[PDB]
Amino acid sequence: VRMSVLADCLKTINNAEKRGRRQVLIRPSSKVVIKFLQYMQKKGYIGSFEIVDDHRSGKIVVNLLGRINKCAVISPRYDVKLDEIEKIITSILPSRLFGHLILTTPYGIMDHEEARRKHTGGKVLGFFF
Amino acid sequence: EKSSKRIFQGEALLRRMVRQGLLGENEEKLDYVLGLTLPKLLERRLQTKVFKLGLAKSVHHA
């Protein structure tokens, strides 16, 4: 069975981007996926997407820019302190300067830069670059 | 940046470098602290300073 929706979605996108497909259909839509794509969109690492409805969870069709080098989901949903963030980013991201490590916080889902500015730790969701 | 501990400690360390004579006046940023280099530090030995200023005629003489 699927378990976490999000991991399948990024894995699917990532394959399409590595392959050079230009557009791709993510099968099991959810609230979290919408937030993730929208967050990615805000910081310009993916294009416009159409969520097409159903009556059983929708589907989403996402326009690729030919720009994502790697996107994946961190699992299980590890807890992480505001203090710990630097050590996480150093470990995962391909550079300190660029790419994004994405969290779920009481103030919403955002990347680390935002979290640092805010305050609040949370659970780590995934990352892209 | 703007972190209270960071501004305080960084400035303090840098001021200590200025006292030592490791960093010039124009530089005042932590990447010039990283830029510090082993001849630059040796250049601040008292024997070196004497040899430069005179008195002796050799480093060994100094």
Binding site: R67, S95, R96, F98 | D31, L34, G35
Partner: protein, 224 residues
Amino acid sequence: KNWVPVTKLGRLVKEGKIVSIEEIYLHSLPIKEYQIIDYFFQPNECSHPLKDDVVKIMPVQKQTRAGQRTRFKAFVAIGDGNGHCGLGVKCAKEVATAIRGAIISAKLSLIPVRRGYWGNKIGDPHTVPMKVSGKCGSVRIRLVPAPRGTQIVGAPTTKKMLNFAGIKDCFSSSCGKTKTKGNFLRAIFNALSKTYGYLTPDLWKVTNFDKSPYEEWSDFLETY
């Protein structure tokens, strides 16, 4: 020095229509004549030398009814000290010949590395601008960016090769049989080679195309 060119690209470089090695890199052309590389980086009246070094000479034997048949394989490293490394391999019957051939191969291989920095604009480039990994055989080598508060934290071999490329400060790691020297060198070379392939924010934006040298100097080739 002043050879007769075999092919069109070479002919253009001899004459001086082609400005510098960047232009041929830009259009990803096959730099077949060693003379082309040699002309751009000729050691006097130019910015920086190309420095050679024989990193490893290893004996290999075919084995025959009569006996051994000993060849000498040679791994050689070439580097400008300012953005260009080259990894050269030649296997030949005798030692001096093998080295000479290897230096030719090394010049042919020559690749430009992308250089960047850990933090800020207030240094010129000094480190590998993002994590890059190159694998060959068993051995996988990863270059990972470090502040200027560092040297090259690596194997002797990695330190030498990366220094040759003109990348001052890095953190390195490795997994597998590093002792298999040639494979380790090739892996390092691939890792360096990957550096300008990456695509990063500095390169997100669209831009125009220069004309290919084959089209820009079409007339000058057509006349011969």
